[PDB]
């Protein structure tokens, strides 16, 4: 561990005081947004949160409980949401208007992700067992993938809009090339329970979380299992997963945030939240040691890895 990591703890540097389902930085890591069961997307200024004694600069009320947020990687002011009615909405946080309301899903949509490299493209996954690919210039879905089980998470590859990872209630990660959706490129088995999150560390490194109380690392160039991470408790809830080039962080049903270095299977450190409660959302500030966290009480903390 000493070769790979210089950290032993997480420091709390700010706190905002139900469930927060999603917490995400905008394109420049300047603003962040929260959303969840209270039917409200709240936008905060990160530097104000860190420097001050805590009010959002924008709030947008919604028709349904929110499951996920994804900021646009090109249009600074645009953010997508998925909700419990199945609706995938693109919002403008300056005008507060919904720019697009995509309504084809028949059940709760659990996840939405805006592509980094083709930024008008966004993908969603739903309890209706469909993955839908959307373009912000078109009202109808561009691609539909009919799957056999509830979709819990979808994520675009960071280097190409042709590939998506799909975490399924069937316990597998389905990795698709959107140029030919008749079969996935590869289906990664290993998790013993539903796959609740998928996130990329890099073009070829995919991480997942599952209610089998593990995170797993996968090689999507050569289609190989790499590593399994253990320590946290996650047997039933969406507890959050965030990764960067070197680190994975996830929530726990013990109301603790866990951090792993990608080369080491047991945690570098953990943090007991001030709160019966579970961590519900986490987000790294890009490749820095700073991260946003939130729990089922609605408390938000800014944490930083420290020696």
């Amino acid at each position: 561990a000493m070769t790979f990591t210089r950290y032993s703890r997480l420091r709390v540097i700010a706190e905002i005081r139900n469930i927060v389902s999603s917490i995400e930085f905008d394109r420049d890591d300047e603003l962040f947004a929260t959303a969840g069961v209270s039917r409200c997307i709240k936008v905060f200024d990160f530097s104000s949160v860190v420097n001050e004694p805590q009010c959002p600069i924008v709030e947008m009320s919604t028709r349904s409980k929110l499951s996920c947020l994804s900021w646009n990687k090109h249009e600074k002011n645009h953010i997508a949401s998925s909700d419990y009615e199945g609706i995938v909405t693109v919002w403008d946080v300056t005008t507060r208007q919904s720019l697009m309301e995509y309504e084809e899903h028949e059940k709760r949509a659990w996840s939405v992700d805006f592509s980094r490299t083709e930024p008008s493209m966004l993908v969603s996954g739903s309890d209706d067992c469909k993955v839908k690919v959307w373009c912000t210039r078109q009202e109808a879905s561009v691609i539909n993938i009919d799957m056999k089980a509830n979709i819990c998470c979808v994520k675009y590859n960071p280097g190409s809009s042709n590939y998506i990872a799909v975490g399924s209630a069937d316990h597998h990660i389905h990795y698709y090339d959107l140029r030919n959706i008749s079969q996935p490129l590869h289906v990664f088995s290993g998790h013993k329970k539903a796959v609740s999150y998928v996130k990329f560390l890099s073009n070829n490194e995919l991480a997942s979380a599952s209610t089998d109380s593990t995170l797993r690392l996968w090689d999507v160039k050569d289609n190989l299992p790499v590593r399994t991470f253990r320590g946290h408790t996650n047997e039933k809830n969406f507890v959050g997963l965030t990764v960067n080039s070197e680190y994975l962080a996830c929530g726990s049903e013990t109301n603790e945030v866990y951090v792993y270095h990608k080369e080491i299977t047991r945690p570098v450190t953990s943090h007991r939240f001030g709160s019966s409660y579970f961590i519900s959302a986490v987000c790294w500030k890009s490749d820095s040691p700073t991260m946003l966290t939130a729990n089922s009480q609605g408390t938000i903390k800014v944490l930083v890895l420290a020696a």
Partner: peptide, 8 residues
């Protein structure tokens, strides 16, 4: 309640 679905 934020419960993950599971086909099994």
């Amino acid at each position: 309640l934020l419960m993950v679905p599971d086909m099994y």
